[PDB]
């Protein structure tokens, strides 16, 4: 059917430490990249991280050559719409990635005001993003396929500014 042995992920999603821990769940989690169950590999990126898992399928991510969790690229980091446009990947890339890719989700009780968890709340009790921007309006195939990619649109537009 669909089996795997090791996750093809990026160094940003792998965690900011040489030693990590993986958890393999064979044939589960319903990977929507190929509509087939894959080995869901959960891990911990570090202290105060998101502790996410694998989302895309194994064979479905081999043709795209992107991360298992971030699903951007393999070496540069641009989206698939920006990678298929064009070196163009040398200038659009950026080393030392931000912690927002490994940051946890927001607290819905903090947005509602009744954050009864307190200082032991694992979620981030900060302000959410602006919904007027297209950066918080992506989808499943919108990030995987190059069609309707808002992150790739601003990457080619801001590349010619000065």
């Amino acid at each position: 059917w669909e089996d795997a042995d090791f996750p093809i992920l990026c160094q940003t999603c792998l965690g900011e430490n040489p030693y990590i821990r993986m958890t393999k769940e064979k044939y589960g989690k319903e990977c929507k990249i190929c509509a087939r169950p894959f080995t869901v590999f959960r891990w911990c990126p570090g202290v105060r991280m998101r502790f996410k898992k694998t989302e895309v399928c194994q064979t479905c991510s081999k043709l795209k050559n992107v991360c298992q969790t971030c699903l951007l690229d393999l070496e540069y980091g641009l989206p698939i719409q920006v990678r298929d446009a064009g070196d163009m990947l040398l200038k659009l890339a950026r080393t030392t990635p931000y912690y927002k890719r490994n940051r946890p989700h927001i607290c819905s009780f903090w947005v509602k005001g009744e954050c009864k968890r307190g200082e032991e709340c694992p979620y981030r009790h900060e302000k959410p993003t602006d919904p007027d921007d297209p950066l918080a309006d992506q989808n499943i195939k919108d990030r995987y396929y190059g069609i309707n990619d808002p992150v790739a649109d601003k990457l080619l537009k801001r590349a010619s500014t000065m």
Binding site: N17, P18, R21
Partner: peptide, 18 residues
């Protein structure tokens, strides 16, 4: 390229976290 090791998981997780 995968390359496993036969080291202990207890001493490796204790040394990296320290």
């Amino acid at each position: 390229y995968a390359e496993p090791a036969h080291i202990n998981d207890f001493m490796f997780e204790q040394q990296r976290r320290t």
